[PDB]
Amino acid sequence: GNFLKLPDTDCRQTPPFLVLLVTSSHKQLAERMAIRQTWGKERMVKGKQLKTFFLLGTTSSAAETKEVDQESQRHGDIIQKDFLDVYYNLTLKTMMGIEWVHRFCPQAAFVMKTDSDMFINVDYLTELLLKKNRTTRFFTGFLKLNEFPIRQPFSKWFVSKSEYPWDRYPPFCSGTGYVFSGDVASQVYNVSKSVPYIKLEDVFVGLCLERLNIRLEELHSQPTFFPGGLRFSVCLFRRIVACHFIKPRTLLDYWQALENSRGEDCP
Ligand SMILES: OC[C@H]1O[C@@H](O[C@@H]2[C@H](O)[C@@H](OC[C@H]3O[C@@H](O)[C@@H](O)[C@@H](O)[C@@H]3O)O[C@H](CO)[C@H]2O)[C@H](O)[C@@H](O)[C@H]1O
Ligand SMILES: *[C@@H]1O[C@H](CO)[C@@H](O[C@@H]2O[C@H](CO)[C@@H](O)[C@H](O)[C@H]2NC(C)=O)[C@H](O)[C@H]1NC(C)=O
Ligand SMILES: *[C@@H]1O[C@H](CO[C@@H]2O[C@@H](C)[C@@H](O)[C@@H](O)[C@@H]2O)[C@@H](O)[C@H](O)[C@H]1NC(C)=O
Ligand SMILES: [Mn+2]
């Protein structure tokens, strides 16, 4: 698949239950390290295998390139392809991750694509996934069902009419963090080249799911994905899946809080 870097992992030998694909830019080593030290640490979660990989492209900067080659050598958990890693190539990045699942890890029961400034509660997500009994053509997160493209030309999410010419976006899930059964990766990759491109990755995946007739569903009767962020409490964070707007220091403090308070009960 023209991959420059691949993780040493055999999904055939050890079918992972949950694969996390974390998008971050080259300079966000602090983010990736905070994640490797917290929700990204690989482990058995109720006897299910959790794997974590970081999605990177390439950069002009020779310094950053070397940093990243060193990071890959030292951690063996980077997935890389040769595309200029910038905000407006995030769709390539996402399709890279999806391609990886399709070519090298089709045995993953579930896959989560997430941002770097996130708290992810893998234990509770594992619990909700086992409860859901939806093992194929499954896709969830924070549902965005009737979104209008941003036409303000200076907004970070601006798309012109020629980039996306219709009034509404298909249904999609916030790219802060979305989860799908592993089969979905193959289907999305298969259709990706026949779907109109758009530089917003979560919208693009929504276009593919719509072409595949894969409908978005809520993970649980209570909201569990929070792109807007949350006021922190140990008891709320024990009963959510994902929370955005979390910088590395904060991520570590919250992780420490959840450790310090383990074993205490919450109403
Ligand atoms: O490469 C794409 C990039 O997209 C990011 O998602 C974007 C947001 O989901 C969305 O937010 C616009 C706006 O929508 C309102 O309904 C409210 O929910 C408000 O809070 C929100 O800010 O904007 C665009 C579509 O216009 C989406 O792409 C995503 O978070 C990134 O990780 C990345 O995937
Ligand atoms: C997305 O990545 C592609 C691949 O890296 C970029 O395309 C290249 O851009 C460089 C400029 O940095 C050119 O020298 C190459 O000729 C281009 N090649 C190809 C195959 O595209 C593309 O520019 C990136 N997208 C954005 C918006 O920067
Ligand atoms: C997932 O499946 C669970 C299985 O429990 C037993 O088997 C299923 C097929 C039903 O017959 C159920 O009534 C049995 O107790 C269910 O308990 C569980 O409710 C299912 N998940 C959801 C979200 O409903
Ligand atoms: Mn973010």
Swiss-Prot record:
Predominant subcellular localization, coarse grouping: Golgi
Gene3D superfamilies in UniProt: 3.90.550.50
Pfam families: Galactosyl_T (PF01762)
GO biological process: lipid metabolic process; oligosaccharide biosynthetic process; protein glycosylation; protein O-linked glycosylation; response to bacterium
InterPro entries: Glyco_trans_31 (IPR002659)
Tissue specificity as recorded in UniProt: Expressed in stomach, jejunum, colon, pancreas, small intestine, testis and gastrointestinal and pancreatic cancer cell lines. Hardly detected in lung, liver, adrenal gland and peripheral blood leukocytes.
UniProt keyword terms in alphabetical order: Glycoprotein, Glycosyltransferase, Golgi apparatus, Lipid metabolism, Membrane, Signal-anchor, Transferase, Transmembrane, Transmembrane helix
Pathway: Protein modification; protein glycosylation
Entry superkingdom: Eukaryota
Gene Ontology CC annotation, any one: endoplasmic reticulum
Enzyme class per UniProt: transferase
Known catalytic reactions: a globoside Gb4Cer (d18:1(4E)) + UDP-alpha-D-galactose = a globoside GalGb4Cer (d18:1(4E)) + UDP + H(+)
E.C. number: 2.4.1.-
GO MF, one example: N-acetyl-beta-D-glucosaminide beta-(1,3)-galactosyltransferase activity
Residues glycosylated per entry: N89, N133, N190
UniProt keyword Transcription regulation, yes or no: no
Mode of membrane association: Single-pass type II membrane protein
Keyword check for Transferase: yes
Job of this protein: Catalyzes the transfer of Gal to GlcNAc-based acceptors with a preference for the core3 O-linked glycan GlcNAc(beta1,3)GalNAc structure. Can use glycolipid LC3Cer as an efficient acceptor.
Official protein name in the record: Beta-1,3-galactosyltransferase 5
Species per Swiss-Prot/TrEMBL record: Homo sapiens (Human)
Gene: B3GALT5
